[PDB]
Design a protein around this ligand. Sequence first.
Ligand SMILES: [Zn+2]
Ligand SMILES: [Zn+2]
Lengths: 240, 240, 81, 81
Amino acid sequence: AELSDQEMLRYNRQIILRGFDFDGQEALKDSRVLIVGLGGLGCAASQYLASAGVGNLTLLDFDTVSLSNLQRQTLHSDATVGQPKVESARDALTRINPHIAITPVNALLDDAELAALIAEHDLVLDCTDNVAVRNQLNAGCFAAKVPLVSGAAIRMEGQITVFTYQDGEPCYRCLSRLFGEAGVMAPLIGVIGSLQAMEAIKMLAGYGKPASGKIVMYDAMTCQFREMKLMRNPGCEVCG
Amino acid sequence: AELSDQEMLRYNRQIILRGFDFDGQEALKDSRVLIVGLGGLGCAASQYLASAGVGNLTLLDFDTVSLSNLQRQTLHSDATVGQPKVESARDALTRINPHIAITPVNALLDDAELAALIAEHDLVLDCTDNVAVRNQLNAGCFAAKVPLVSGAAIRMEGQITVFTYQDGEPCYRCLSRLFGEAGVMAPLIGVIGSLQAMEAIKMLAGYGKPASGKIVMYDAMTCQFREMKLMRNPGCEVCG
Amino acid sequence: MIKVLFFAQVRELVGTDATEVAADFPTVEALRQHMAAQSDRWALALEDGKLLAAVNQTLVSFDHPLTDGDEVAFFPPVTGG
Amino acid sequence: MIKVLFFAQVRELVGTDATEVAADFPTVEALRQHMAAQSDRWALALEDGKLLAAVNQTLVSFDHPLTDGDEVAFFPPVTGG
Ligand SMILES: [Zn+2]
Ligand SMILES: [Zn+2]
């Protein structure tokens, strides 16, 4: 990529980070990221991916903005209640950073369509609300070896893990195999979403060390963070 | 406070949290919070305090929006470059939640003015950029016993601590006495700011346990969180 | 002793952040079933399928063995969301 | 041995996340001064006034004593900001 003079000034505070530099900012400009789910986590993650300069964002979600969403989905507003979340989010994100390209996809995609869509991106964010879509994304990401930055939140608890699909690394099924409406506190989505954005930037630019091979769990009631190692499960149906 | 039917539906996901309930949401509605500094941390914290339903926000900052801010201060936009940060933020926050009262104060206040301003609020957020203003706030908060939720970020490192000024608890000087431009990665502000908002909600509603007596440090390069105990320093000039 | 930690909703439902137990639990499953049968409330918090467990900071399956000195952390999975 | 951990910019400047040192350092200050004098780069990372230290997970002043077995964490303060 080539940054304009105006972009160099906009992204100054990132450019001057030692091991990030112009090359890191250019890496972001040249990146293509797929964000799946434009609810709480997706609004939080996308806002900082956009501000940070990630050049191409695809926004995927089938749902519309509802009054109850507005407690935590800060890209959406009372004026956009009833609109597809991807459109409401796109309009907000383009104001956050007019230099990037935002593609809204208002659809519920099947596996064949997801395979194509995943393969066309550098990195995928899982900001969805259910294990069915999350398993779908993990399967597609695993097959194409496209990193998945996975965030989840409910009540007062959040989690993040990055799946890079390197040999010997666990996938989402290695975790999901361990188990089988409710409230959520607004800023929890901000914490997890922002962590997702951070991990995505780190992966795109090759900056720092990704949060792979561990679950980072945030317990908001006591402001405690626990890192627990995640091992590959030998017979997991996806990567076993 | 009394929540309207429309507010009850907007705040549903918080209301249904067990030990939060209608009383917790009413506590937020009735709260008055002072946010000092409407740059990166302040934009991040204020957006979720507003969405969450904190009823009265005072926004304090003397500075104007600049092109370089837009990499991380997502309430501001290219259209508001040159405007006071408190005005740009107020206009954005009122769209996030039209039910709350936002008071912008575009000033650099002295200690006498701060004492009055602090005493008029239930809780203060330190989202400033320098130790001089931070020490100012700690001194005022200490004298009035008004909790201070303090966040800081630079490069790839963030910190949060809550000062409740209970007997035997450290204050900010107990920490600041341990020491005596640079870049910053955009989503780092999101993580810390959102934690600040969370801790503020917890204190206002009396929900969970505040992050007092410890520094929570986020090392974004390795996605590591370290909690380190903070003890009162015997002769600290403020609380010693 | 085995140190057993509870986080998030588990902790909020059972009323304690930590308890030391005798080392008479062969696996995480024995420990869980024992604790789950104390009350309906305990059975809800530790409901199979609605629970994760870490031993010495590693996520494990419930068939994992326990040994004196081990730290066991019980907490909920999240798909929020 | 004393375990010494480095975080954030400290780690990024010195090139290691951790190193075990002999227990010949009376205080955090002796440990810091010794490490700081290895190179200009080390002196920048551990510059007095631009450094925090935790011993066994408690923030301490640099006059705090060290003992064999102790874990010492060195990391920068932040006022960002
Ligand atoms: Zn797997
Ligand atoms: Zn003090």
